[PDB]
Each structure stands twice: as structure tokens, then as C-alpha cells.
Design a protein around this ligand. Structure first.
Ligand SMILES: *[C@@H]1O[C@H](CO)[C@@H](O[C@@H]2O[C@H](CO)[C@@H](O)[C@H](O[C@@H]3O[C@H](CO[C@H]4O[C@H](CO)[C@@H](O)[C@H](O)[C@@H]4O)[C@@H](O)[C@H](O[C@H]4O[C@H](CO)[C@@H](O)[C@H](O)[C@@H]4O)[C@@H]3O)[C@H]2NC(C)=O)[C@H](O)[C@H]1NC(C)=O
Ligand SMILES: *[C@@H]1O[C@H](CO)[C@@H](O[C@@H]2O[C@H](CO)[C@@H](O)[C@H](O[C@@H]3O[C@H](CO[C@H]4O[C@H](CO)[C@@H](O)[C@H](O)[C@@H]4O)[C@@H](O)[C@H](O[C@H]4O[C@H](CO)[C@@H](O)[C@H](O)[C@@H]4O)[C@@H]3O)[C@H]2NC(C)=O)[C@H](O)[C@H]1NC(C)=O
Ligand SMILES: CCCCCCCCCCCCCCCCCC(=O)O[C@@H](COC(=O)CCCCCCCCCCCCCCC)COP(=O)(O)OCC[N+](C)(C)C
Ligand SMILES: CCCCCCCCCCCCCCCCCC(=O)O[C@@H](COC(=O)CCCCCCCCCCCCCCC)COP(=O)(O)OCC[N+](C)(C)C
Ligand SMILES: CCCCCCCCCCCCCCCCCC(=O)O[C@H](COC(=O)CCCCCCCCCCCCCCC)COP(=O)(O)OC[C@H](O)CO
Ligand SMILES: CCCCCCCCCCCCCCCCCC(=O)O[C@H](COC(=O)CCCCCCCCCCCCCCC)COP(=O)(O)OC[C@H](O)CO
Ligand SMILES: CCCCCCCCCCCCCCCC(=O)OC[C@H](COP(=O)([O-])O)OC(=O)CCCCCCCCCCCCCCC
Ligand SMILES: CCCCCCCCCCCCCCCC(=O)OC[C@H](COP(=O)([O-])O)OC(=O)CCCCCCCCCCCCCCC
Ligand SMILES: CC(C)CCC[C@@H](C)[C@H]1CC[C@H]2[C@@H]3CC=C4C[C@@H](O)CC[C@]4(C)[C@H]3CC[C@]12C
Ligand SMILES: CC(C)CCC[C@@H](C)[C@H]1CC[C@H]2[C@@H]3CC=C4C[C@@H](O)CC[C@]4(C)[C@H]3CC[C@]12C
Lengths: 334, 133, 334, 133
């Protein structure tokens, strides 16, 4: 008995229904309200400059052709019904019009309210391009965009709006973070317009603001280099008559800095521009090299405690300390 | 002669022979056109990676000429001219290698690129330690 | 005209065909010849102890029910025909019977020869478990298995054999390597039997022999540690009357080794057992610590060149050199 | 009194006070049962990670007792007994910290676990440098 009543309702809805025509194609503009729940923010691939994200993508719109009256005010139907009616062809595209990789599960819930409002949500895994500027690496931040919109309908036919306040229309799960070496500080939600060869389209954009975590590189590179620079300056306190010992000191320390420098970029991709870390390593290398050069000058004048050593005991620590203050203040105050 | 007397001459001549050879590359591509072509690329990056260097009107061409000019001037001095000026040339080279090593490390080039400079840096200072008895 | 002839052939083959019964279910054992072409050996995930592989999986067998005679001796048909006939239910399973992750593309070529021989190949991406023993890390090697067989048919019903010589039946593409920190030395092909709760099954196995590349860790950890140990022993050549200088030397060097040790395992997973690298770092730490302890003893007897320093100049370099010979010979001769 | 006279006593008492406290944990769990429970786990791994140590009949129980016995014996000596034996105790502790640091680094424990030993290692040697004028 119950099935017969619902079978008639479905037949009535599809009787004379033309899924080839969008609602309001001749009367008004179809307004689609959208919101995104990020179930997990997948890992970031620096080599490919891309990132993965798993979301519950929810879309809602009104289609007056699907009005009905019956025992229930809302029809929670199987997702199979979605393929039988017209739905927006929304897709996630990286850049201007290139659709990004999409993996949609078969389940796509469809709920029709008696008023004719439709709720249509799907589970998607989107891999998107996130170009990165690594000039400030490892103290850099990136805004990874997520852009989507209509493929075929221009702004004069379909417009997208956020279901609620734009900030509250994109929600990130509390424990969905899959980032290893990045911290998700937040995201900004915005919308814009793109004019392509096929026309003008509405694009909904969200930027996820990521900040690199420096802890790994502080332990791996910066700290060993700082101790090496400090270690090299201890030579100024040794007596000038220990030429074999201090020469081995200078050469060995330069070798250590060379080894540390080689392993620092072993992991990073071969980018043409120089990063902030390279500048720090290069300056430290100069200090270690200069420490040995100072001894060579001292030995040349060895016939009393060298005046060059006494001054180097102050100039070298002072300049290096000043350099750290400017370097860290420059890349952290931002 | 004594090993020290022979050894110092070999290092002094060799370093001046090699460093003048490098200085020629940065100036005249006749010896190796390919070397100059790649060399100018390196010095383009260094200034581009040192804005303030370029904010004072100093370009890569001026930078390339100066370093090459001093290496050849100091390289020949360490080969022919004896006495105190010979050692003074050695110190100036020691003051350029770190600048070279401060540029290669400021762009993250591999060891193979800047290995030659580092090796001669050890020899260059070692020669100074044996400047006189 | 051509379509009509082929339509009749297909109808004749399917006339009275029972796809529920394997060929030879009452006469003989169905022999299936298999070979694998590895188009790419995907990356290895140490954290998950798994690996990915993309292959062209080819299977061939004879089904006398599909004999035919016509203008062509071989029918290169659309893969849709495969679903309409009986095919082996071969799957890739990790361990004993747990089917591993499989991603099969829609295309599954089917070719039927006039003799009744069938060729059935499919494109698969298999993620498989590869348990790793990291005792010899980073000088370790692993044999990652790839096991597959019938899910429902026992050895008394279905048996798998290699199409040709077992070594030549598994071919790895020359440029298919997707390994970053591993080297594929080769693979060994074998077959066995597994007795499960549901019966006894034939399992075809291939082991891929992987060897870790030590280059990254030599630059990152071993070399800085070796130079630090050498650097610490230079103190024995300094005069005993430089207590402030040598104390800073000892403390600073110990700090550097502490920093290097911390960053060495920063990347490795938290495994309970100790690796080969840990032993090397621990021994180097003892040498650096002992260098400072030697000076403390020397200062205690400072009222001439200390006899302890003269002996330490030989004992310390000698023992460390011997330790390297035994360590590297032990983990490389294998 | 002089800063050196005051400073040496504080370090000598504190290190013996702390090291005897550690030695008690490895022996008697009365002070902290949880500490002994986790401590025995650490020494189980160390021997298990040093087969030859266990190939000579030496077990973790014997290892745990010996280290705790020497730390307390040397810790009290550095607190009460003056003179040359006081310094001898300091050297023996210096010979155990590296063994402790050779075990923690032989299992890859984080800094927090072995930070306390390292800090007192610096103080332990620093005290020896100020053993006498
Ligand atoms: C992302 O999600 C989509 C949808 O689920 C996946 O399928 C792709 O959907 C697109 C629409 O959203 C399709 O355009 C695309 O395939 C298109 O095929 C057109 C030709 O039509 C033939 O093929 C389709 C698909 O098999 C078939 O249904 C149809 O009956 C025909 O046989 C092409 O014209 C079209 O090309 C478009 O872009 C090119 C860019 O150069 C233009 O030149 C064309 O004019 C045109 O605008 C397109 O190829 C669907 N593709 C597939 C494989 O299903 C995507 O696969 C998902 N992304 C990923 C990465 O998987
Ligand atoms: C690997 O490749 C396979 C094949 O393409 C993918 O699909 C799985 O195929 C298996 C056979 O090769 C199926 O067993 C498995 O689903 C099974 O479903 C049985 C119940 O049948 C219902 O569901 C199926 C699938 O939707 C449907 O066709 C059928 O009409 C019924 O509605 C289960 O009994 C079976 O469980 C088996 O293992 C459990 C282990 O505990 C036993 O207890 C059971 O007795 C039984 O032996 C199984 O779940 C197919 N699964 C899916 C999702 O399609 C796999 O998905 C591929 N792997 C991966 C990781 O995707
Ligand atoms: C008492 C003092 C004792 C001092 C002893 C010093 C011993 C040598 C010190 C070692 C420091 C350098 C170590 C370099 C290791 C890597 C070399 C290497 O791989 O070189 C080539 C290729 O080398 C090989 O294939 C192997 C070379 C083996 C032979 C090495 C010989 C070394 C001789 C050293 C002599 C030192 C003399 C010192 C005298 C005072 C490739 O270059 P990369 O290092 O990869 O460049 C970086 C690239 N990237 C950042 C992208 C990773
Ligand atoms: C003239 C000589 C000058 C010597 C100056 C020495 C200065 C200190 C030297 C630094 C060496 C140690 C650096 C450790 C950095 C990391 C600390 C850290 O993160 O500690 C906690 C948490 O720390 C924090 O969250 C931040 C702590 C900030 C405060 C640090 C204070 C340091 C004081 C040093 C005093 C040195 C005095 C020397 C006197 C001779 C977590 O431990 P992890 O290091 O992560 O342990 C390893 C874990 N895993 C392998 C899995 C990665
Ligand atoms: C003559 C001696 C002078 C000594 C001067 C000392 C000045 C104070 C500094 C002393 C040592 C500071 C050591 C700081 C360790 C920080 C470790 C770390 O990872 O810090 C991160 C915070 O970032 C930093 O600390 C950045 C580096 C700070 C500065 C480091 C150098 C010291 C300051 C400059 C010294 C100059 C010495 C000059 C000598 C002449 C935290 O990371 P996170 O919480 O974002 O996530 C990490 C992740 O979860 C894994 O754990
Ligand atoms: C008083 C001074 C004594 C000095 C004694 C010196 C003895 C000879 C050693 C000199 C330095 C050797 C430097 C070797 C660098 C090797 C770099 C490397 O990566 O080597 C790998 C080969 O493996 C090794 O070389 C392993 C380490 C060898 C030994 C390293 C330590 C030196 C030997 C022991 C010295 C002991 C000193 C005692 C001092 C008292 C190659 O990797 P791959 O080809 O497999 O792939 C790498 C990848 O593609 C990225 O490039
Ligand atoms: C990027 C550029 C890096 C440059 C690094 C240079 C390192 C070496 C510097 C050597 C400077 C001194 C050269 C020799 C001058 C001279 O005549 O010295 C002899 C006398 C002292 O004689 P005696 O008392 O030793 O017998 O000397 C005197 O009477 C006067 C001595 C003056 C010494 C001044 C030292 C200044 C050190 C500055 C270090 C800056 C490091 C910056 C690193 C980025
Ligand atoms: C895992 C265990 C690690 C142990 C590390 C120990 C490091 C410190 C070793 C100190 C040994 C000496 C202790 C003091 C003995 C003594 O009486 O010394 C005074 C006299 C010398 O007096 P003076 O001539 O200096 O006035 O002394 C003498 O007359 C005799 C001096 C003999 C010195 C022997 C030195 C042996 C060094 C071996 C180093 C092995 C390192 C192994 C690292 C894993
Ligand atoms: C050889 C001497 C003169 C060099 C002096 C360098 C001085 C002027 C400093 C001041 C500001 C510095 C720059 C600040 C920021 C960056 C971006 C970083 O990604 C690479 C290094 C680079 C480009 C620095 C290079 C060095 C720099 C230009
Ligand atoms: C404190 C003193 C006595 C320690 C002496 C250690 C000697 C005996 C050496 C000889 C063989 C060595 C072992 C050889 C191999 C391994 C496997 C590695 O994954 C961890 C270290 C470990 C387990 C070594 C520990 C140290 C060891 C046992």
C-alpha cells in the first residue's frame, strides 16, 4: 500500500519533466546555495605542488517542477533519483577551467522538501594544484586555492552563493588534519568571475593558509651550523704557537660545514631561486672560513698575544649575533 | 733543495696558474666559450640573489670583471713577483674564495660545482702558513 | 553481412553454455598459465609497511566449450564478453587470504583462439603489505612479496603455472622504477600451497629484493659524526694550560653530537628495536664525551706535556678506526 | 666565603644528592614505583640491544643493580667524604654517564629522557675542573 502511493508520486513528478532545461531558463536566474565540510585535509605534495582533500560537498537549490504533496513533507530518496533529474554540473577546477582530479563515491544523497527545495550532497576526494613560493623557506606560508563552478552555465544562467555567512559556510573538521610538516592556520572564503573563451562563469574560491613548521630544520640545519660557528671562534682563545692543532681545527670545521650544507638541500627539490636557509648556511660558511683565515694572518706575524685575536674575539661573535637578530626578525615578524 | 723550498714554489705557481685561468674564463671566452656562457649565468643569479648589491648600481658585468681582474692580477703575482707582495696577493685570494663560496652556498649549488674552489682554499692558506720560517 | 556472420558465432558459443561450471569440472584439472608485466613499481611506504605496483596481469587458459570455426582463427573481442563467460576469480592477497587493495580499469582484453585458448589481461594497481626488518637500517634489504591465487578453487580444481621459465615469466619494465630511496636489485619467482579454514589453495608468489641506499644517511648523519669525533681528538694536541678554551671545546662538541643525534631519527618511525645507525651514533657520542673526560683527568694532574694526552693521541684514533672497519665490514659484506 | 668554595660544595652535594636519588629508583621502588617500572623496561632493552653483554651471563637485573650501586656509593661520597676519594667518585660517575648516554643513544630515546643525565654530565666534569687550585 505504501509503495503504491509513493510510486504514483514519483510518476507524477517525472510526468512531462524535461531534464534538458534548467529551472527558470526563461523566468529567473537559478540560485544555488553551497557549503563545504572538509572531513580531512590530505597531505601536501611539494614535488608536484598539489594537495589532496576529502570533503562532503553539499548543494541546495529550488526546482519548482518537483513540487509535491503527500504524507511526508520531505522525500529522502535513493541517490539513483539524482541521475534521473537535472542537477548542476558543478566541478572542481584548478586555475581557470581545467577540471581537477575528482573521485566521487556512488552514494550521492538527494532530499526533496515539499516546498520544492533540493539537497544534493556527494563525497569527493579532490587533488588540487597549489603553487608554492619557497623564497622564505622554511619560514614560508602558502594560500592553497580550491576553485569550483559551473562548466557550461554562465553567470547569466547560474549563480553560486554561500548557504550562510561566508566564513561559516566552509567548515573544517577538528581532527581532519593530515598535514605532517605544515600547520593549517585557517582559510578564507571568496567568490569571483572568470571570463574564458566559452563565456563568463562564476567561480567560488577558498584559500587555505598554510604555514611551514620550522622545527625540523632548526634541529637538522640551523642549530648544528650555529654551534659550528661558535665552535670555530673558540680558536681565537688558543695560543698562536699551536699551528698544527689550529690548522686541523680550521680545516675540519670547514669540512663539517660542507657536510652539513650538502645534506640540508638533499631533500628539497632543485629550485632555481635561493631560499632563506641557503643564505643562512652561506653566511655561516663564511664565518667558519674566515676564522681559519684569521689564524693564517696571525701566524704570518708570529715571530705576545696577537692583537688580531683579541679583536676577533669581539668582532666575530658580535657580527654573527647581529646577523641572527636581523635574519630571524625579518622572516618571523611576517 | 729542501722540501719546503720546493713545495712552496709549486703551490704558489699552481694556484696562480689555476686562478688566472679561472679569471680568464670570466673575461675572455676564447679559452672555453661554453665555460663563459655558463659562468655568466652563475653571476646573474648571485646578484639577482643579492638585491642590495644591485641597489647600489653594481651589475653582474661589473661583478664578473672585478673578481676576474683580481684573480689574474693576484695569480700572476703569486707566480713571478717574490717577496711581501707575493704574500699580500695570497691574502686577497683568501678574501675572494669565501666570497665565491658565499655565492655558491647562497644558491645551493652541488659540491662538484664549488669543489675546485674549496680544494684550492685549503692549499691557498696552507701556502701562507709556509710563507716564511 | 560481416556482422551477421559474427553474431551467429557468438550465439553458437553461448548456446547451452553454463558459466557456473569450470571447464573440466568432471574430467580434468583446469591449468591456468599466468605471467606478469610490471609497468611500474610504485613507491614504498615505510610508515604503513606497504608498497604500490601497477601491472599488466595476463592470464591464459583453454576452455573447450568456446571452440569455433570461421574466417578468423582468433577473435579479438570487446572486454564486455569477459563478464558473459566464466573466468578465474584470481585476486592479489597479502598474507594468507586477505585480498589486497585492487583497482582494475574497465578495459580487460579478451582474445579467443580457434583452438579454444583464451587470453585475458587486465590493468591493475595493487597496494601490498611489505613487512620490513629495520635492524640493519640504513643498510637493510627487504623481500616484498606479491601473492595471488584462486579464492574459491582448491588445488584439486585449479592450479596455476608460469607461462614460460619462471624467471622469464615476471618482467619488470626498464624505466618503471618509482623508487626514491630504494634500489630494486631483482626479484625471485616461486609458488607454494596454503591450507586455510576453507581448504587448500595454490599461491603464486614473487619476492622483490630491495636494498636501501645509504647515500642520504652517509651525508646527513655518518659524515658529520665522524668529523666531530676527529675534531674532538684535536684537543689532545692543545696545551693543558688553556682550560677555558678546552672546556668550551668539550662542551660545545658534545652539544653538536646531541643535536645531530636528535635530527637523525627525526624522520624514522618510532621502532622499539635499535638500528645500526643508533649504535654508530652512540659510539661516536662516547668518544666525544670521553675526549672531554680525558681533559678533566689531565687538568687534575696539572701542577710538562701530559702523558695521558700523548697516549690518548694514539689510543682514541686507533680504536675509532678499528670500530669503523668492523662496523662497515659487518653491514656491507652481507 | 669565596664563590669557588661555595660553588664547589653545592655542585658536589647536589650531584650526589641527585645521583643517589636515581640509584635508589633502580633498586627500591618505594620512592616512586612508577619510575622503577619504566626504568626496568629501559634496561631490558639495553641488554636486549647488546647481545654480547647477555652472552657472558650478565642480565638486566645484574646491570641495573651495579649501576645503581655505584651511583649511590659515589653519590654519598661526593656529599660527605672529603679529599682525594671525593674526586675519585667524581671520575667514576663520569665513567658511568657516558655508559648511560651510550645506552640511551643506542635505543634512540628522545632528548627529554636523557636530558637530565647530559646536564649533570656538564656539571659533573665542571666540578672536577675546580677540584683544587
Ligand atoms: C572529473 O569528473 C568527471 C565527471 O564525473 C569525470 O568524467 C569526465 O566528465 C566530463 C564532464 O564533466 C567529460 O567532459 C569528460 O569526458 C569528455 O568527453 C567528451 C566527449 O564525449 C565522449 O566521451 C564521454 C566520456 O567518456 C562520453 O560520455 C561521451 O558519450 C563521448 O563518448 C570530450 O569532448 C570532453 O573534452 C572536453 O575538454 C576538452 C579539453 O581539451 C575539449 O577540447 C572538449 O571540447 C571538451 O570540452 C571530455 O573528454 C569525462 N571524462 C571521463 C574520463 O569520464 C572526469 O574523469 C573526472 N576527472 C578525472 C581526472 O578523472
Ligand atoms: C578487490 O576486488 C574485488 C572484486 O572486484 C572488489 O570487490 C569485492 O569482491 C569480492 C570478491 O572478489 C567480494 O567478496 C567483496 O564483497 C563481498 O560481499 C559478500 C556479500 O555479498 C554482498 O555484497 C557483494 C558486494 O557488494 C554483492 O555483490 C552481493 O550481491 C551482496 O550484496 C561478502 O560475504 C564478502 O565477505 C567475504 O569476506 C568476509 C571476511 O570476513 C567473510 O566473512 C565472508 O564470508 C566473505 O567470504 C565480501 O564482502 C567485494 N567488495 C566490494 C566492496 O566490492 C574489492 O572491493 C577489491 N578490494 C578493495 C580493497 O576494494
Ligand atoms: C685530520 C682531518 C681529516 C679530514 C678528512 C676529510 C675526508 C673527506 C671529507 C668529506 C667531506 C665531503 C663528503 C662528500 C660526500 C659526497 C660526495 C659525492 O657524492 O660526490 C659526487 C659523486 O661522488 C660519488 O659518487 C662518490 C665519490 C667517492 C670518492 C670521494 C673522495 C673524497 C676525498 C676527500 C679527500 C679529503 C682530503 C682532506 C685533506 C685535508 C656527487 O656530489 P654530491 O656530494 O652528491 O653533491 C651534492 C648533490 N646534492 C645536494 C643534490 C645531493
Ligand atoms: C659557548 C657555548 C654556548 C652553548 C650554547 C648552547 C645552547 C643550547 C644548545 C642546544 C642543543 C639542544 C637543542 C634542542 C632543541 C629541541 C628542544 C625540544 O624540542 O625540546 C622538547 C620540547 O621543546 C620545546 O617545545 C621548545 C623548548 C624551548 C626552550 C629550550 C631551552 C634550551 C636551553 C639550553 C641551555 C644550554 C646551556 C648550555 C650551558 C653550557 C622536545 O624534545 P625534542 O628535542 O623534540 O626531542 C626529540 C624528539 N624527536 C627525536 C622525536 C624529534
Ligand atoms: C655565547 C652563547 C650565546 C647563546 C645565545 C642563546 C640565545 C637564546 C637561544 C637559545 C637556544 C634556543 C633553542 C630553541 C629550540 C627550538 C626548537 C623548536 O623546534 O622550536 C620551534 C619554534 O621555532 C624556533 O624556535 C625557531 C628558532 C629559534 C632560534 C634558534 C636559534 C637561537 C637564537 C639565536 C642564537 C644566536 C647565537 C649567537 C652566538 C654568537 C618549535 O616548533 P613548533 O612548536 O612550531 O613545532 C615543532 C614540531 O612540532 C616538532 O617538535
Ligand atoms: C686521519 C684521517 C683519516 C681519514 C681516513 C679516510 C678513509 C677513506 C674515506 C674517505 C672519505 C670517503 C667518503 C665517501 C663518500 C661516499 C658518498 C656516498 O653517497 O657513497 C655511497 C656509497 O656508500 C658509502 O660510501 C658508504 C660509506 C663509506 C664510508 C664512509 C666513511 C669513511 C670510511 C671510514 C673513515 C674512518 C675515519 C677514522 C678516523 C680516525 C654512494 O651511494 P649510491 O651510489 O649507492 O647512491 C647514492 C645516491 O644515488 C645519492 O647520490
Ligand atoms: C667578507 C670579508 C671577510 C674578511 C675576513 C678577514 C679575516 C682576516 C682579517 C685580518 C686583518 C688584519 C690583516 C693584517 C694587518 C696587520 O698588519 O696585522 C699585523 C698587526 C698585528 O701584529 P702582531 O701584534 O700580531 O705582531 O695588525 C695590527 O696591528 C692591526 C690588526 C687589525 C685586525 C683587524 C681585524 C678585523 C676582523 C674583522 C672580522 C669580520 C668578519 C666578518 C665575517 C662576515
Ligand atoms: C667506556 C669507558 C670509557 C673510559 C674513558 C676514560 C677517559 C679518561 C681516562 C683517564 C685515565 C687516567 C686516569 C688517571 C691516572 C693517573 O694517575 O694519572 C696521572 C698520571 C700522569 O700524571 P702527569 O704526568 O699528567 O702529571 O698518569 C699516569 O702516569 C698514567 C696515565 C695512563 C693513561 C691511560 C689512558 C687510556 C685512555 C684510553 C681511552 C679509551 C677510549 C675508549 C672509548 C670507547
Ligand atoms: C657579499 C655581501 C655584500 C652580501 C650582503 C647581503 C645583504 C645586503 C643582505 C641584505 C638583505 C638580504 C636578502 C634578504 C632576502 C633574501 C631572500 C632569500 O630567499 C635569499 C637571500 C636574500 C636574497 C638575501 C640576500 C642577502 C641580502 C641582500
Ligand atoms: C657497553 C659495551 C660493553 C658494549 C659493547 C658492544 C659490543 C659487544 C658490540 C658487538 C656486536 C654489537 C651489536 C651488533 C649489531 C647490532 C644490531 C643493531 O641493530 C643494534 C646494535 C647491535 C645490537 C650491536 C650492539 C653492540 C654490540 C653487541
Amino acid at each position: 500500500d505504501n509503495t503504491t502511493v509513493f510510486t504514483r508520486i514519483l510518476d507524477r513528478l517525472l510526468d512531462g519533466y524535461d531534464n534538458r532545461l534548467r529551472p527558470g531558463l526563461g523566468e529567473r536566474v537559478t540560485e544555488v546555495k553551497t557549503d563545504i565540510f572538509v572531513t580531512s585535509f590530505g597531505p601536501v605534495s611539494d614535488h608536484d605542488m598539489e594537495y589532496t582533500i576529502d570533503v562532503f560537498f553539499r548543494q541546495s537549490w529550488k526546482d519548482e517542477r518537483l513540487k509535491f504533496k503527500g504524507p511526508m513533507t520531505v522525500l529522502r530518496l535513493n541517490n539513483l533519483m539524482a541521475s534521473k533529474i537535472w542537477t548542476p554540473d558543478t566541478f572542481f577546477h584548478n586555475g581557470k577551467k581545467s577540471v581537477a582530479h575528482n573521485m566521487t563515491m556512488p552514494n550521492k544523497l538527494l532530499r526533496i522538501t515539499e516546498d520544492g527545495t533540493l539537497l544534493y550532497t556527494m563525497r569527493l576526494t579532490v587533488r588540487a594544484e597549489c603553487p608554492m613560493h619557497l623564497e622564505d623557506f622554511p619560514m614560508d606560508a602558502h594560500a592553497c586555492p580550491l576553485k569550483f563552478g559551473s562548466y557550461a552555465y554562465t553567470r547569466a544562467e547560474v549563480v553560486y552563493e554561500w548557504t550562510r555567512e561566508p566564513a561559516r559556510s566552509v567548515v573544517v573538521a577538528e581532527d581532519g588534519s593530515r598535514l605532517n610538516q605544515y600547520d593549517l592556520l585557517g582559510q578564507t572564503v571568496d567568490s569571483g568571475i572568470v571570463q574564458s573563451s566559452t563565456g563568463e562563469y562564476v567561480v567560488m574560491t577558498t584559500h587555505f593558509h598554510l604555514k611551514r613548521k620550522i622545527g625540523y630544520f632548526v634541529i637538522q640545519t640551523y642549530l648544528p651550523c650555529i654551534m659550528t660557528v661558535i665552535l670555530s671562534q673558540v680558536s681565537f682563545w688558543l695560543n698562536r704557537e699551536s699551528v698544527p692543532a689550529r690548522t686541523v681545527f680550521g680545516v675540519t670545521t670547514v669540512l663539517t660545514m660542507t657536510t652539513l650544507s650538502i645534506s640540508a638541500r638533499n631533500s628539497l627539490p632543485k629550485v632555481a631561486y635561493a631560499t632563506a636557509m641557503d643564505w643562512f648556511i652561506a653566511v655561516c660558511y663564511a664565518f667558519v672560513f674566515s676564522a681559519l683565515i684569521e689564524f693564517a694572518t696571525v701566524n704570518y706575524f708570529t715571530k705576545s698575544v696577537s692583537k688580531i685575536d683579541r679583536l676577533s674575539r669581539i668582532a666575530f661573535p658580535l657580527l654573527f649575533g647581529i646577523f641572527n637578530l636581523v635574519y630571524w626578525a625579518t622572516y618571523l615578524n611576517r | 733543495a729542501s722540501p719546503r723550498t720546493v713545495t712552496i714554489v709549486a703551490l704558489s705557481v699552481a694556484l696562480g696558474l689555476f686562478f688566472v685561468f679561472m679569471g680568464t674564463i670570466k673575461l675572455t671566452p676564447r679559452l672555453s666559450k661554453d665555460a663563459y656562457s655558463e659562468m655568466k649565468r652563475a653571476y646573474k643569479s648571485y646578484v639577482r640573489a643579492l638585491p642590495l648589491l644591485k641597489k647600489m648600481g653594481i651589475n653582474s658585468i661589473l661583478l664578473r670583471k672585478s673578481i676576474g681582474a683580481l684573480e689574474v692580477a693576484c695569480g700572476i703575482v703569486m707566480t713571478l713577483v717574490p717577496g711581501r707582495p707575493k704574500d699580500v696577493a695570497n691574502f686577497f685570494l683568501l678574501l675572494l674564495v669565501l666570497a665565491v663560496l658565499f655565492f655558491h652556498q647562497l644558491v645551493g649549488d652541488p659540491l662538484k660545482r664549488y669543489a675546485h674552489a674549496l680544494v684550492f682554499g685549503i692549499l691557498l692558506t696552507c701556502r701562507l702558513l709556509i710563507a716564511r720560517k
